[PDB]
Amino acid sequence: GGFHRREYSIGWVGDEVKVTEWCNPSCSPITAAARRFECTCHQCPVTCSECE
Amino acid sequence: EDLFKDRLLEIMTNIQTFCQISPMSDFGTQPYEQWLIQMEKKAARDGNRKDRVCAEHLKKYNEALQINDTIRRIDAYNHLKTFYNDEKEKKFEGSLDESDIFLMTLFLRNKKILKKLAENPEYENEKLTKLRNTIMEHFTRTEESARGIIFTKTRQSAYALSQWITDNKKFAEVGVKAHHLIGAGHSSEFKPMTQNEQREVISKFRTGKINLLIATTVAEEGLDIKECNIVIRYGLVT
Numbered sequence A: 001g002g003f004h005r006r007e008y009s010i011g012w013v014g015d016e017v018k019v020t021e022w023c024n025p026s027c028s029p030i031t032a033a034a035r036r037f038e039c040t041c042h043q044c045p046v047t048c049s050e051c052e
Numbered sequence B: 001e002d003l004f005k006d007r008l009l010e011i012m013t014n015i016q017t018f019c020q021i022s023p024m025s026d027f028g029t030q031p032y033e034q035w036l037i038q039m040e041k042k043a044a045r046d047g048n049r050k051d052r053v054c055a056e057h058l059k060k061y062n063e064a065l066q067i068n069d070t071i072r073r074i075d076a077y078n079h080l081k082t083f084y085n086d087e088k089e090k091k092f093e094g095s096l097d098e099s100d101i102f103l104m105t106l107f108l109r110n111k112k113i114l115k116k117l118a119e120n121p122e123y124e125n126e127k128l129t130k131l132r133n134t135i136m137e138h139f140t141r142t143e144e145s146a147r148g149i150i151f152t153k154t155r156q157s158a159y160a161l162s163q164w165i166t167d168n169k170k171f172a173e174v175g176v177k178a179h180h181l182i183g184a185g186h187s188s189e190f191k192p193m194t195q196n197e198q199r200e201v202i203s204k205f206r207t208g209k210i211n212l213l214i215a216t217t218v219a220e221e222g223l224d225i226k227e228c229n230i231v232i233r234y235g236l237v238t
């Protein structure tokens, strides 16, 4: 744990692209699924520069 | 509109005509892919050799369509060339029949035009552009601590994305060192990577010798590396 892991989802319809982005705690699992996890290590910050 | 794509579609039409099939689904779509997958299985059951090999080859072309659409033309061309190079190797130098001859000659007829279309410098599509800007912005911003994983749907996609990074020196100039990461089991779609090779790649990612893994989703079990500070999901949901 300790920081924010930036998460992205790049998807499309035809060649029209939509990007979703958010932050996970660095202690949370790395997954292909688009998940929003909570911090279990208790050392991860509430926000970073990237999520305000 | 896309002459390379158009050639591929023309070829696939020829093959469908040769084995006399006309599926409701459109080329390049998942339900079309699932349909080829069923036809191929049935042909092995019923022992229909013509139908089995045609479905097998049609899958290689469907795969090339998807690479063309999501990464580059050159990578789609390489996917097909490598496949036909392997077929030539294992079968034309035997248990070779009319369908093998027909498919191989059909590709060779088109190979040089496909090659030259692939060699023409093309602008990147929006998907790859968005991927580039995401990698670039993240790498400039986080610099030496940039540690990322890109998840993609297929082995051939992960390999192609890696080749594209290498082909593009600007990535290297902001620190990017990428490598593909794929499973050990046999797939018709692509070569495997041994569990050993996987472990070495991951080790290099741990030490920072590699800082951008491009993996299939069927890897996530052993990719829980706390130091990763970015994950990009590239076309997992379409």
Ligand SMILES: [Zn+2]
Pocket: A001, A002, A025, A026, A027, A028, A039, A040, A041, A042, A043, A044
């Ligand atoms: Zn935490």
Ligand SMILES: [Zn+2]
Pocket: A004, A022, A023, A047, A048, A049, A050, A051, A052
């Ligand atoms: Zn954040």
